[PDB]
């Protein structure tokens with residue numbers, strides 16, 4: 001019977017209309033107000049384009065959604081409206097649809113991002129602390145509003161390196177947290193899927209996002225994209241096991257009385273825990289300081305209940321200089 005250690009009662013205390021996204025009655029804006037300038041991104045659920053608001057002539061992001069259930073689209077919209085205005089949360093400006101096809105488009109404030117594959121390698125030690133801290137504000141905020149992002153990964157973190165601005169995007173897989181609720185484990189992207197999803201523990205919570213963040217963080221400091229490189233869901237768990245060790249996994253499975261699929265349990269085998277320093281090399285030496293390791297260690301824990309909360313992560317000494325600069 002797992003439950004969140006923090007913000008567990010957020011949706012319990014708020015009006016049913018706050019979290020009842022299926023009751024939402026979408027108020028469609030004007031399709032023609034926004035025009036496509038250039039394609040900038042794509043995914044299995046949508047196509048993204050840099051656009052222009054014909055009225056004010058300012059930039060915008062046009063996320064054209066691929067065919068999907070009415071329920072899922074109202075969910076992303078409700079979540080975007082509830083989070084609009086929060087620290088580093090992408091800002092939903094409008095919602096429109098194509099009359100004939102009914103193809104919906106979500107309009108967002110613009111963010112001039114820089115592909116992480118090219119950006120990350122140039123980030124300095126301080127840049128990593130700064131940006132991870134900013135991403136942390138976004139997670140503590142959405143969690144405090146009773147929402148799990150469920151798809152934290154580089155591609156969903158827009159970074160304008162010039163203006164040092166950060167935005168957490170694509171809430172298409174986000175969901176409201178309800179104590180005891182059993183959620184679908186088919187969320188997030190494989191490399192950032194936490195153990196809970198890989199072993200079918202359905203009653204997960206905000207902590208799922210912290211494992212994902214931890215994967216991102218580990219990839220940045222160790223300069224290894226992605227950190228846990230698995231080919232399918234089974235292999236994803238195996239790559240994690242060979243690092244954290246199988247004792248921790250077995251302890252985890254016993255705590256939540258979970259039985260691993262015979263096949264999976266066979267693939268995982270048995271592995272000793274590998275110290276985080278064995279991943280250091282001349283390419284990442286200038287980033288793997290002791291504070292970084294202590295911090296990463298507290299994020300990548302099998303037991304989702306053991307992981308630091310977004311709020312705790314922000315106070316870790318690792319971010320001490322980022323906080324000091326902010327409070328100046």
Ligand SMILES: c1ccc(Nc2nc(Nc3ccccc3)n3nccc3n2)cc1
Nearest residue numbers: 040041042048061108110111112113158
């Ligand atoms: C991959 C890339 C972008 C998105 N969506 C996406 N892209 C951007 N900005 C952007 C601009 C230029 C190049 C890349 C991103 N933004 N900016 C705000 C929201 C958003 N969503 C989705 C997947």
